[PDB]
């Protein structure tokens, strides 16, 4: 009936990563109750079960030396970017068996938030993540694991879009990437943006936030 909602703030990734491993552990132990983790990384490139080497354009070590992170991971999808400005989601539920389900859940939510600001986003039938006409406005990959999911979404909120010139995701796409400030033409402060979320997820999943 109720999930907790944390605000980490801006956390690195790695941190940011053995805190969502404890956290997952404990709703697996039922010592938890579902968790939405809300919060922003410094500048870093992840790579996930259908990446590879085609998806960054420069070396790693290029990466490394122009101030990203970068890092191999479990979750779906190839190569993503998180940095200040957007908004990642880490909900740590206990979906079971039902992860495509789970992930239409999210998709829905965030829909829900961009129809806040008066934008109309959708899922698309054909790519993952929610898009605004041809660009992506939300990426979604997560990881499920004892029947409770970990990784997330990142929505772009004030996100440095330039940022994702760098790498190069596989298979079908639209064309681009956008955020709430490229398509409002103006900054949407963070701590509205987390706000709008929680009331969508408590809406679509049907659970009080905590
Ligand atoms: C935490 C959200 C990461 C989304 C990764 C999307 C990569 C799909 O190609």
Redesign the pocket.
């Known amino acids: 009936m109720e999930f907790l909602v944390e605000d980490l703030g801006l956390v690195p990734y790695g941190e940011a990563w053995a805190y969502q491993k404890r956290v997952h552990r404990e709703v697996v132990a039922g010592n938890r109750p579902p968790t939405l983790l809300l919060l922003e990384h410094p500048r870093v490139i ?1 790579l ?1 079960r ?1 990446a590879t080497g085609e998806n960054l354009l420069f070396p790693e070590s290029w990466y490394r030396e122009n101030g990203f992170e970068l890092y191999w991971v479990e ?6 970017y998180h940095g200040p400005g957007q908004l ?1 989601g ?1 909900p740590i539920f206990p979906v079971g068996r039902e992860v495509r389900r789970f992930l239409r859940q999210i998709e829905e939510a965030i829909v829900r938030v961009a129809a806040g600001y008066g934008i109309s986003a959708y899922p698309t039938p054909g790519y ?2 929610v898009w605004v006409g041809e660009d992506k406005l939300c ?3 997560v990881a499920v694991k004892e029947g409770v999911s970990f ?4 929505l772009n909120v004030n996100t440095d879009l330039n940022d994702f010139t760098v790498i190069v ?1 596989c298979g079908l796409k639209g064309k681009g990437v956008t955020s709430l400030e490229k398509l409002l033409g103006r900054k949407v402060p963070m701590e509205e943006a987390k706000a709008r979320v929680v009331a969508a997820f408590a809406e679509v999943f049907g659970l009080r936030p905590v």
């Open positions: 992840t996930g259908k979750r779906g999808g190839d190569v993503t990642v880490y993952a993540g990426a979604i990959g990784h997330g979404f990142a995701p």
